[PDB]
């Protein structure tokens, strides 16, 4: 859930790969995770977030890549 090449960590454990999207516009990467209402152990839950990061100057927008860990941590990275 921090920022550390350029890379960002992020916890999205409650979201599935098809509920996440990553997009780059205007030197800004935008991360959105959305799931419609689904039953859980306690009742029904729907979640949504949008997270934006400004890309560092050197970074090429076309080279930015993303990968979701299977235990629910999303990383986004690029090199300069």
């Amino acid at each position: 859930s921090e920022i550390r090449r350029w890379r960002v960590s992020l916890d999205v454990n409650h979201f599935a790969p098809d509920e996440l999207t990553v997009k780059t516009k205007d030197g800004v990467v935008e991360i959105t995770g959305k799931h419609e209402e689904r039953q859980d152990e306690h009742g029904y839950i729907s979640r949504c977030f949008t997270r934006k990061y400004t890309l560092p100057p050197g970074v090429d927008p076309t080279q930015v890549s993303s990968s979701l860990s299977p235990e629910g941590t999303l990383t986004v990275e690029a090199p300069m």
Binding site: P17, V22, T24, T62, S65, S66, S67, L68, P70, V76
Partner: peptide, 7 residues
């Protein structure tokens, strides 16, 4: 799981 990135 290498998720896409659109621009």
């Amino acid at each position: 799981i290498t998720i896409p990135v659109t621009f």
